[PDB]
Amino acid sequence: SNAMFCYQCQETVGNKGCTQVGVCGKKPETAALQDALIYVTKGLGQIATRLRAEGKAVDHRIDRLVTGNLFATITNANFDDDILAERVRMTCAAKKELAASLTDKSGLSDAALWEASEKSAMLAKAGTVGVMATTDDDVRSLRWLITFGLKGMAAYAKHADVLGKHENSLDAFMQEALAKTLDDSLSVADLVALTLETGKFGVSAMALLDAANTGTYGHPEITKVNIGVGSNPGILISGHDLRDLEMLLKQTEGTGVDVYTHSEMLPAHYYPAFKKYAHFKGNYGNAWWKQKEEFESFNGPVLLTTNCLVPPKDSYKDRVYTTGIVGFTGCKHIPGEIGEHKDFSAIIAHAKTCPAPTEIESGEIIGGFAHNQVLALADKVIDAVKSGAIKKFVVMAGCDGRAKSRSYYTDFAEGLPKDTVILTAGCAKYRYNKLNLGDIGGIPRVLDAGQCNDSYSLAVIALKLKEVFGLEDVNDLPIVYNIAWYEQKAVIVLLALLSLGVKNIHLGPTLPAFLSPNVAKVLVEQFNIGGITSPQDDLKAFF
Ligand code: SF4
Question: GO cellular component terms?
Answer without folding.
Answer: cytoplasm
